[PDB]
């Protein structure tokens, strides 16, 4: 299957006193491996997976230096963006940045990305060609001109096709016991009767990794979306994920309905029946 390395940065201005909140998180696939929090005691990039603790002091010094550089750019950006949008010093505003690379099953480069948002809206994004920019509005267009003049796309393309995929491959190897392991969903059905004429069947998928999963209902072997509820996939808190899908059925007709579970960890999809 495909793999990804992604970094997520959140920047929140705190008008009244002092510096903005800065939070950085790094993931391989659906596994957090590093964090930085401006408000934490260490003022260091910190490990959040055992396989990254394999990295020497030089790694933690380098990642701490780079994440502090990211933090200072975001601090300046909050000021720049307040200027571009003619906003007062009084309001809290949010910057978000996400960048990273996807590799296929062969661990070769598939795609790179670098997306930036201001107050929860698209600002500027690197296009799939890693050579050009999507600017949402005229403030972002000013940034696009600046980044074109400074050859930012060329710098990011070199990282995304190079260091990003090289270090993703290193992490996948070092963390192979967990990162290269698929955890198939543990599945069961439950039954809930609201009235004498209506019952709800719930199809559960527990303790799976990675998070990507498809739960579908059929009635007499045909797909049914009517009278179904699918919850957002949610973290168990132990690194695995959970999901359920529910269908409302006439009391006594439970046997017509089947739940279908697709997951990377399953050689063939599972079928459950009440």
């Amino acid at each position: 299957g495909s793999h990804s390395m992604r970094y997520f940065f959140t920047s929140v201005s705190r008008p009244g006193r002092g510096e903005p909140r800065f939070i950085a998180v790094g993931y391989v696939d659906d596994t957090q491996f590093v964090r930085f929090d401006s408000d934490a005691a260490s003022q260091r990039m910190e490990p959040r997976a055992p396989w990254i603790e394999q990295e020497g002091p030089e790694y933690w010094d380098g990642e701490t230096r780079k994440v502090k550089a990211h933090s200072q750019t975001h601090r300046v950006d909050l000021g720049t963006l307040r200027g571009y949008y003619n906003q007062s010093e009084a309001g809290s505003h949010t910057v978000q940045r996400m960048y990273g690379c996807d590799v296929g099953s062969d661990w070769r480069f598939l795609r790179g990305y670098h997306q930036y948002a201001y107050d929860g809206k698209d600002y500027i994004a690197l296009k799939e060609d890693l050579r050009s920019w999507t600017a949402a509005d005229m403030a972002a267009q000013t940034t696009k001109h600046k980044w074109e003049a400074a050859h930012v796309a060329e710098q990011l393309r070199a990282y995304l096709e190079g260091t990003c995929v090289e270090w993703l491959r290193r992490y996948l190897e070092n963390g192979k016991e967990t990162l290269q392991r698929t955890d198939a969903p543990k599945t069961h059905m439950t039954h809930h009767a609201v009235s004498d004429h209506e019952a709800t069947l719930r199809c559960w998928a527990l303790s799976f990794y990675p998070a990507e999963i498809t739960l579908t209902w059929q009635r007499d072997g045909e797909d049914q979306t009517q009278d179904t509820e699918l919850v957002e996939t949610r973290p168990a808190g132990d690194g695995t994920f959970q999901k359920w899908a529910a269908v409302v059925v006439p009391s006594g007709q439970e046997q017509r309905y089947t739940c279908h579970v697709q997951h990377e960890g399953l050689p063939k999809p599972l079928t459950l029946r009440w």
Binding site: E63, V67, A69, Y84, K146, W147, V152, Q155, Y159
Partner: peptide
């Protein structure tokens, strides 16, 4: 590993 630099908007 993080990218080395971040150019301001």
């Amino acid at each position: 590993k993080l990218v080395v630099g971040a150019v301001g908007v």
